[PDB]
Design a binder for this molecule. Structure first.
Ligand SMILES: O=C(Nc1ccccc1)Nc1cccnc1
Length: 460
């Protein structure tokens, strides 16, 4: 039985509003309702992995797992295996996979982050799961961020705390946060960003939604505007939104948005908003295609509608050769030519690089670079032709061209990373000098750039 080179992944996010679900939730897992929906001809075809994120979840883990497994068995006639379940307060993540994948999945990690301080610590935060699927690392984050239209900057702060402190994936990747640890990272939840229009415009917004005219609402969505201004979710993708706002509904119908201020809301307005979202970030030049992004219309126990997204995702096989794993493949090498880092720092420490990759036996430290002053104020760290030649464990081009090199630039004085990025080895040519580039981030914000040339030697 051949190892897959693609899988499909279901992502669900639902703020359940502290209510039990209705008897039937199959529409969610079938990607049926509003938006980019899944073709009826696929309804019996199971996804490889289902990742369910809930917020305000009133159920026990056992109670929700039974509902989810029942739901999938009714759709697919497959009994899914539980990969992981993790709950923080009423924020939960469940990962289910087809039984045929049980031996393909390993290195399962879970963690949570509690956001806020004192008053604002005790119900918001995130849970996450990561694992390896054959040679491919997968990460999943379900976050419930701060509520309220006038708290976008708190949400952004909650995002940075979660990506700094959530401890998933390979702990040896010490300079790297979750935004660099995975081939594919999915981040979803009740992110709680709102449509920023005046309160007086509530009925006008409702009208627009009834006309399925979302453009003038999406142009005020705080998540899209904060992402455009590089305030949050830098280097993440989101499919185009073509479904109505998923919050805030009267329960037991979807005919009414409940937006007016009430004692129950802390006298806050809840204008119709796209609170419930799925974003992703995959390594450069890895296949990832969104095949659905939408909301259900028939699950009405909460003041939010469930959101679904599905993905095709490239995966690779657990490569063995006669050499690697457990030795080098002398035939293989990676050379960096004429490389330099451009950093936004005011610091004047010397810097060195670390190269990390599962195609290396262990990470590689460079010599210190040569600091120059750039034209428009910046620090340029030149490495020239000084960088160590990297010796991959396997030289077969079918393996090596699918790998990635994570780069950290670290201060010699503190050994702290000032920037992290990722280079694909999926090159147009081998034995040929080719341009490479990555932005560098630290704590998920832009700190610089790394560019130069690469020369990759494979066994072919
Ligand atoms: O995010 C954007 N591009 C991108 C995404 C991932 C990696 C690198 C670049 N563009 C964007 C964002 C928000 C509004 N309009 C455009």
């Amino acid at each position: 039985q051949p190892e897959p080179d693609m899988i499909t992944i279901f992502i669900g996010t639902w703020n359940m509003g502290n209510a039990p679900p209705p008897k039937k939730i199959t529409s969610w897992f079938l990607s049926k309702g509003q938006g980019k929906t899944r073709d009826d001809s696929a309804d019996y075809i199971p996804h490889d992995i289902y990742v369910i994120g809930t917020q305000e979840d009133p159920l026990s883990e056992k109670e929700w797992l039974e509902i989810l497994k029942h739901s999938l068995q009714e759709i697919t006639s497959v009994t899914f295996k539980t990969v992981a379940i993790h709950t923080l307060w009423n924020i939960r993540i469940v990962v289910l996979a087809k039984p045929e994948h049980e031996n393909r999945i390993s290195h399962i990690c879970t963690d949570n982050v509690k956001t806020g301080i004192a008053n604002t610590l005790g119900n918001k935060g995130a849970v996450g799961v990561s694992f390896m699927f054959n040679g491919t690392s997968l990460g999943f984050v379900n976050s419930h961020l701060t509520s309220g239209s006038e708290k976008k900057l708190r949400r952004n702060q909650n995002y940075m705390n979660i990506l700094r402190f959530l401890a998933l994936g390979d702990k040896k990747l010490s300079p790297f946060n979750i935004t660099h640890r995975f081939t594919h990272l999915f981040w979803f939840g009740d992110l709680n960003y709102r449509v920023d229009l005046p309160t007086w415009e509530a009925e006008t917004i409702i009208q627009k939604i009834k006309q399925q005219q979302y453009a003038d609402l999406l142009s005020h969505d705080q998540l899209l505007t904060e992402r455009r201004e590089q305030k949050v979710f830098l280097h993440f993708e989101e499919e185009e939104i073509t479904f109505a706002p998923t919050y805030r509904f009267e329960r037991l119908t979807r005919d009414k948005y409940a937006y007016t201020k009430q004692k129950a809301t802390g006298m806050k307005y809840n204008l119709p908003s796209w609170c419930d979202r799925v974003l992703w970030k995959s390594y450069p030049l890895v296949h990832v295609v969104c095949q659905s992004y939408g909301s259900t219309s028939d699950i009405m126990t909460s003041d939010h509608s469930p959101v679904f997204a599905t993905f095709e995702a490239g995966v690779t096989s657990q490569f063995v050769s006669k050499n690697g794993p457990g030795t080098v493949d002398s035939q293989g090498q990676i050379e960096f030519l004429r490389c330099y880092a451009t950093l936004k720092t005011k610091s004047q420490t010397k810097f060195y690089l670390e190269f990390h990759s599962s195609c290396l036996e262990s990470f590689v430290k460079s010599q210190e670079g040569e600091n120059e002053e750039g034209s428009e104020g910046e620090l340029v760290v030149k490495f020239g032709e000084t960088l160590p030649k990297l010796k991959p464990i396997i030289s077969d081009p079918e393996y090596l061209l699918d790998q990635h090199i994570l780069i950290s630039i670290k201060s010699s004085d503190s050994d702290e990373s000032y920037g992290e990025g990722c280079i694909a080895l999926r090159l147009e040519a081998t034995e040929t000098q080719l341009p490479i580039y990555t932005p560098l981030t630290h704590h998920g914000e832009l700190t610089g750039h790394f560019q130069g040339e690469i020369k990759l030697q494979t066994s072919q």
